[PDB]
Amino acid sequence: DRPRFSFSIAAREGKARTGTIEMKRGVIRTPAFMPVGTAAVKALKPETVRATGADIILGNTYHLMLRPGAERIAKLGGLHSFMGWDRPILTDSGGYQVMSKQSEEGVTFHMLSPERSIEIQHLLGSDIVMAFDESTPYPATPSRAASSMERSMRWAKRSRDAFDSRKEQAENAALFGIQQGSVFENLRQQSADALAEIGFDGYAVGGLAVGEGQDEMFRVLDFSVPMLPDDKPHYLMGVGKPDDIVGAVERGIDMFDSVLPTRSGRNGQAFTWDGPINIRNARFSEDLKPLDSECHCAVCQKWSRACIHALIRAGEILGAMLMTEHNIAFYQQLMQKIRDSISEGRFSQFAQDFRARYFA
Amino acid sequence: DRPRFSFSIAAREGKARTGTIEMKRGVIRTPAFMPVGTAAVKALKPETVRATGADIILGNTYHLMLRPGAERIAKLGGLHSFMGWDRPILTDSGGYQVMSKQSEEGVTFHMLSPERSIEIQHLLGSDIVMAFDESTPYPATPSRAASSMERSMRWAKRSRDAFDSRKEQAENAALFGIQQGSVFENLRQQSADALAEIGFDGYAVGGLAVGEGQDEMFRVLDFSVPMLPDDKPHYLMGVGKPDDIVGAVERGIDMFDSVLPTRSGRNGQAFTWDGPINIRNARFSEDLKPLDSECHCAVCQKWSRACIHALIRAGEILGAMLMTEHNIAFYQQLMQKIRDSISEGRFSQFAQDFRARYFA
Ligand SMILES: [Zn+2]
Ligand SMILES: [Zn+2]
């Protein structure tokens, strides 16, 4: 038997936690990195993405709405059938890409509201559904940030009720709420209280990674994450670089997603424990070592820097495929070392060792 | 203005010759190697084959008859349009693959005769047409070899007349006759006299490279090639390994074709000036040198043994493409060094240097 959504914390160190989310389509090890998915020849195969270590992938609701459309994905059997991925899928609400009519009802651009966003995510058949919120701009006036937070909370309630109105969705999926409030601690507290009063399966910290820089993002995390319910997962959306991830786990974040491994891989850039490298650099043309000396991904078991350099410089799509697979696998190995070090009570030392070497 | 078929000898050394065949679709430098073509994603691009140095490619009439068929190729505009190759094309008669009813009329298996073979080659629109002959088996009884030679000469006359009956073919293409007679000098002489009496644009030495070994092939060439008209091209069909080619040029052969560069490339084997190599061998996994140290093909300008080794071992089709391109380019560079050394009167020394190093 498998539960709808069950978060268990197995070990803690400071604010960091490691554990599992059990869902009907599988178990998610936390802290978790979710690669951002696309349709299943122009992308990695889903078995390849699974083999990198990913327990869950993300679907971009806005892009799926535009092509091929949510009703079409439903007729094809849902997003799992469409993507060839049978493990859990999280979908965002589509609201951020709308920004990236505009009344309290929702927006038209296609129409999106709390109710329509929840309905589209049900048509996709995703396992974790994000509430529809309003993104405060960056930077945000204290006036504008107060406005978008309060609208987001009324929309979070509407998301809650829309989700609960479909037995098939409410019995089989989970719903996450999104805290807003920008850099204003009192707003963040009001937002957290509102979401906790409504009740969600997990809570995301919104309004971050939108240009504010890491020091400010960390300062906001420092007081925002403790406000959320301790016994539910904490999600930092769209983050990020490896050092962003490590420091966010130090501050209590359990879940992450980012296109960065894919964007980097397509641009000829590989993540390594010694920092990112540009594989086109001449120093790699005769380098017989793998992309990363310690990475145990399938690419680093077989391919040298020299030969990936050759593929990338020739514009062979295989080069970008190999880079992307390694980058996503590197991210999963980072999450695994994070999980292991929390379990063994040496995560704070892991983070310091990681930073000293990554920025050396 | 461009002539139908004009063979000019520019320089000689012993029995070896170098020169040009001018045809309406281009000039063929001799001695020439003709790669064996196929349809134009599962093959090298025709611009790639041209860039290796090939002046003319071969079409396999029997395979083209079976798929998509000669009438279909004609409706598509002919073999040049079908293959994306606008330079000269030679077609064989289809008769050897028939072996590899059977009366004096021809054969049924589809039907092939001197007349039908010439007609199919006209439908293909090829520039050099081979007469239809009868292949004596290997090894051949002195009885069987006498029979197949004499039938071939009657069929050579029928080929001549069929070709001459179509103004469009006779004014724009050329026709080659094929000497037969197996290892019997008197038969070879009878065959040569018959073909010279009929008259052809060029003459092939048939019945060789069918299992007899190089020493016997060379012994037959020694007396067979001098029997053919000196002022027309001499063609040794389906030959062969680099050392076969060098020794055949020493004996007066001007033209060659072989699937060997392609078959080798698909099997992970590369020709080099130091002999062929099996790129899968472990010694190449860290070898940063190109396939051949002196080859100036596009592959050796960019790719290392190590990375082609990696591609081949992974089963990436790019690996086989690169190997095949290099092998066909290596063959063209061999022909160019042959042509250059004859022009400079140092071909006999070239051949000895070539053998000492290729078999070292
Ligand atoms: Zn790797
Ligand atoms: Zn080469």
Distance (Å) from the C-alpha of residue A266 to the closest C-alpha of chain B? 19
Distance (Å) from the C-alpha of residue B307 to the closest C-alpha of chain A? 5
Sequence spans of domains, chain A: 5-264+327-360
Q: How far is CA A208 from the centre of its chain?
A: 13
- Written as one string, the DSSP assignment of A147-163 is HHHHHHHHHHHHHHHHH
* Alpha helices for A105-229 (secondary structure H): 114-124, 142-164, 167-172, 185-198, 214-224
Contact assessment for residue B261 and residue B328, using Cβ atoms and an 8 Å cutoff: yes
Q: Please give the distance, rounded to the nearest whole angstrom, from the Cα atom of residue B198 to the centre of ligand 1.
A: 69
Any idea which ligand is nearest the CA of A277? 1
Q: Please give the distance, rounded to the nearest whole angstrom, from the Cα atom of residue B118 to the centre of ligand 1.
A: 59
Which one from B55, B244, B254, B257 is the annotated catalytic residue?
Answer: B257
Reduce the secondary structure of chain B to three states and give it as a string.
CCCCEEEEEEEEECCEEEEEEEECCEEEEECEEEEECCCCCCCCCHHHHHHCCCCCEEECHHHHHHCCCHHHHHHCCCHHHHHCCCCCEEECCCHHHHHCCEECCEEECCEECHHHHHHHHHHHCCCEEECCCCCCCCCCCHHHHHHHHHHHHHHHHHHHHHHHCCHHHHHHCEEEEEECCCCCHHHHHHHHHHHHHHCCCEEEECCCCCCCCHHHHHHHHHHHHHHCCCCCCEEECCCCCHHHHHHHHHCCCCEEEECHHHHHHHCCEECCCCCCEECCCHHHCCCCCCCCCCCCCHHHHHCCHHHHHHHHHCCCHHHHHHHHHHHHHHHHHHHHHHHHHHHCCCHHHHHHHHHHHHCC
Q: Closest to B310 (Cβ–Cβ): which among A303, A314, A316?
A: A303
Any idea which ligand is nearest the CA of A265? 1
For residue B341, give the nearest of B208, B257, B250 by alpha carbon: B250
Both tokens assigned to B217: 């092939």
Q: B303 contacts in A (CB within 8 Å)?
A: 310
What resolution does the deposited structure have, in angstroms? 1.9
Catalytic machinery residues of A: 92, 257
d(CA A168, CA A170): 6
Give catalytic status of residue B92 as yes or no: yes
Which one from B92, B127, B201, B292 is the annotated catalytic residue?
Answer: B92
Known binding residues of A for Zn(2+) are 295, 297, 300, 326
d(CA B134, CA B131): 10
Q: Please give the distance, rounded to the nearest whole angstrom, from the Cα atom of residue B333 to the centre of ligand 2.
A: 9
Answer yes or no: do A288 and B306 touch at CB < 8 A: yes
The response to whether B133 counts as a known ligand-binding position is yes
Place of tokens 């293909």: B124
3-class DSSP state for residue A341?
A: helix
d(CA B154, CA B179): 12
* Best to test chain A binding among B311, B313, B321, B325 (most A CBs inside 10 Å): B311
Q: Please give the distance, rounded to the nearest whole angstrom, from the Cα atom of residue A308 to the centre of ligand 1.
A: 12
**Burial (0-12, 13-18, 19+ Cβ within 10 Å), B12:** middle
Cα of first residue to Cα of last residue in chain A, in angstroms, is 48
The structure was resolved experimentally with X-ray
Could you tell me which CATH class the domain B5-264+327-360 is placed in?
alpha beta
d(CA B268, CA B210): 24
For residue A196, give the nearest of A184, A178, A210 by alpha carbon: A178
Residue A293: which region, alpha, beta or left (left: phi > 0; alpha: psi -120 to 50)? alpha
Task: Provide long-range contacts, Cβ within 8 A and 24+ apart, for B99-103.
Answer: B99/B135
Q: What is the DSSP letter of A36?
A: B
d(CA B77, CA B73): 7
Distance (Å) from the C-alpha of residue B57 to the closest C-alpha of chain A? 28
d(CA B55, CA B332): 9
Answer yes or no: do A310 and B318 touch at CB < 8 A: no
Answer yes or no: do A303 and B288 touch at CB < 8 A: no
**H/E segment holding residue A65:** helix A61-66
**H/E segment holding residue A176:** strand A174-179
Any idea which ligand is nearest the CA of B305? 2
Known binding residues of A are 92-96, 133, 180, 207, 295, 297, 300, 326
Answer yes or no: do B306 and A307 touch at CB < 8 A: yes
Q: B307 contacts in A (CB within 8 Å)?
A: 304, 306-307, 310-311
d(CA A164, CA A104): 21
Answer yes or no: do A306 and B306 touch at CB < 8 A: yes
Any idea which ligand is nearest the CA of B277? 2
Chain A to chain B Cβ contacts (< 8 Å): 28
Place of tokens 């009366």: B103
d(CA A164, CA A158): 10
Residue A198: which region, alpha, beta or left (left: phi > 0; alpha: psi -120 to 50)? alpha
How distant, in Å, are the alpha carbons of A49, A57, A261, B344 from that of A37? Answer: 9, 6, 12, 64
Q: How far is CA B138 from the centre of its chain?
A: 20
Q: Please give the distance, rounded to the nearest whole angstrom, from the Cα atom of residue B292 to the centre of ligand 2.
A: 6
The response to whether B252 counts as a known ligand-binding position is no
Chain B: residues touching A (Cβ < 8 Å): 286, 288, 302-304, 306-307, 310-311, 314, 316, 318
> Please, which residues have CB within 8 angstroms of residue A356's CB and are 6 or more apart in sequence?
none
Q: A310 contacts in B (CB within 8 Å)?
A: 302-304, 307
Answer yes or no: do B310 and A302 touch at CB < 8 A: yes
Cα of first residue to Cα of last residue in chain B, in angstroms, is 48
Answer yes or no: do A286 and B286 touch at CB < 8 A: no
